[PDB]
Amino acid sequence: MIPGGLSEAKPATPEIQEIVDKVKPQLEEKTNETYGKLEAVQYKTQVVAGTNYYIKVRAGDNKYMHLKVFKSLPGQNEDLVLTGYQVDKNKDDELTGF
Numbered sequence: 001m002i003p004g005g006l007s008e009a010k011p012a013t014p015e016i017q018e019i020v021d022k023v024k025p026q027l028e029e030k031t032n033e034t035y036g037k038l039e040a041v042q043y044k045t046q047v048v049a050g051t052n053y054y055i056k057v058r059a060g061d062n063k064y065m066h067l068k069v070f071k072s073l074p075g076q077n078e079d080l081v082l083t084g085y086q087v088d089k090n091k092d093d094e095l096t097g098f
Contacts, residue, residue: 005047006096010044012057017039017040031087041091050072052070054068069083
């Protein structure tokens with residue numbers, strides 16, 4: 001049931017820009033780059049032990065940067081983790097199952 005959401009590339013929102021804005025610092029230390037404002041543009045949801053994430057945020061300049069985070073449904077003050085992320089990505093690159 002629910003074979004990987006990954007529905008159409010939904011339009012980023014204030015909650016999506018928050019997921020990538022929360023991993024912005026976890027990205028410069030996991031890939032070794034100095035990203036910046038990640039204006040979310042699109043994002044695909046997911047499912048498994050809660051709800052993963054997919055986001056194609058712009059890396060400040062015209063550059064971009066996909067994103068992948070996991071959200072715990074249960075738990076108190078959680079901390080969305082950065083499951084993955086496609087550095088140096090563009091707009092022609094779709095998140096798809098990644």
